[PDB]
């Protein structure tokens, strides 16, 4: 086509989706990770995660307001990944890298899994 | 903070939100523009438009499944702007620029209004 493109548009959309998440606006699901609860938008979760894409395209699960994750999932690892989904920024630290990588593998977030593997390999 | 950032994350999220729109997945509103109907995600519309941000933060309008736009709004101008919201690409042409600018002013999409004004000024 002969379209023009606004470079900062995708980043501006994501920034606004994060603002709606912080103010709890039009969030339509709660993700339960052991004792912890996280409110989010189903569309954003599907757009970032192969696991959520599979769950919310399912004819019965698409209508659930609560999703319970596997009990082995660490709430802090989930929180870091949810923050990444809404911002593009990953808070990866020596103290959380193993939990972040295991959560990213479970959530099917291949680019996160890749950077965790590289950061681990460098420390070996 | 000490976060790392994935450069293509925002663009990848927007690409996936557009794929969900094309397959009509978890769309929660229909925008009526005279005889034409457009399905979309309320969160994306709010993230891109000052008008939709105002409508869907309203305690009564947030629950509507149908929104009727002003009859002066051109359906093609709306379609071009909806495509821009989901892709960052604006199909701006001599034959549609006046309708696109008027629709962007109504929708309160200031960056679109700005480029339309500049493209019009250059033709004068």
């Amino acid at each position: 086509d002969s379209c023009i493109q606004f470079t900062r548009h995708a980043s501006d959309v994501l920034l606004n989706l994060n603002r709606l998440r912080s103010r709890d606006i039009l969030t339509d699901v709660v993700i339960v990770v052991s004792r912890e609860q996280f409110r989010a938008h189903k569309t954003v979760l599907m757009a970032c995660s192969g696991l959520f894409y599979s769950i919310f395209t399912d004819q019965l699960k698409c209508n659930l307001s609560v999703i319970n994750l596997d009990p082995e999932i660490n709430p802090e690892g989930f929180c870091i990944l949810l923050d990444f989904m809404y911002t593009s920024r990953l808070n990866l630290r020596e103290g959380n890298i193993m939990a972040v990588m295991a959560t990213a593998m479970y959530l099917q977030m291949e680019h996160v899994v890749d950077t965790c593997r590289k950061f681990i390999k460098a420390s070996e | 903070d000490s976060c790392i950032q994935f450069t293509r994350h925002a663009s990848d999220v927007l690409l996936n939100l557009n794929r969900l729109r094309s397959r009509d997945i978890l769309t929660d509103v229909v925008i009526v523009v005279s005889r034409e109907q457009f399905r979309a995600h309320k969160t994306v519309l709010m993230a891109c438009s000052g008008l939709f941000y105002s409508i869907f933060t309203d305690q009564l309008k947030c629950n509507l499944s149908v929104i009727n736009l002003d009859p002066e709004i051109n359906p093609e101008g709306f379609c071009i702007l909806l495509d821009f919201m989901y892709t960052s690409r604006l199909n701006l042409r001599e034959g549609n620029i006046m309708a696109v600018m008027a629709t962007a002013m109504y929708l309160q999409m200031e960056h679109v209004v700005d480029t339309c004004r500049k493209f019009i000024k250059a033709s004068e």
Binding site: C3, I4, Q5, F6, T7 | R89, L90, T115
Partner: peptide
């Protein structure tokens, strides 16, 4: 704005 750019030419993509």
């Amino acid at each position: 704005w750019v030419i993509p």
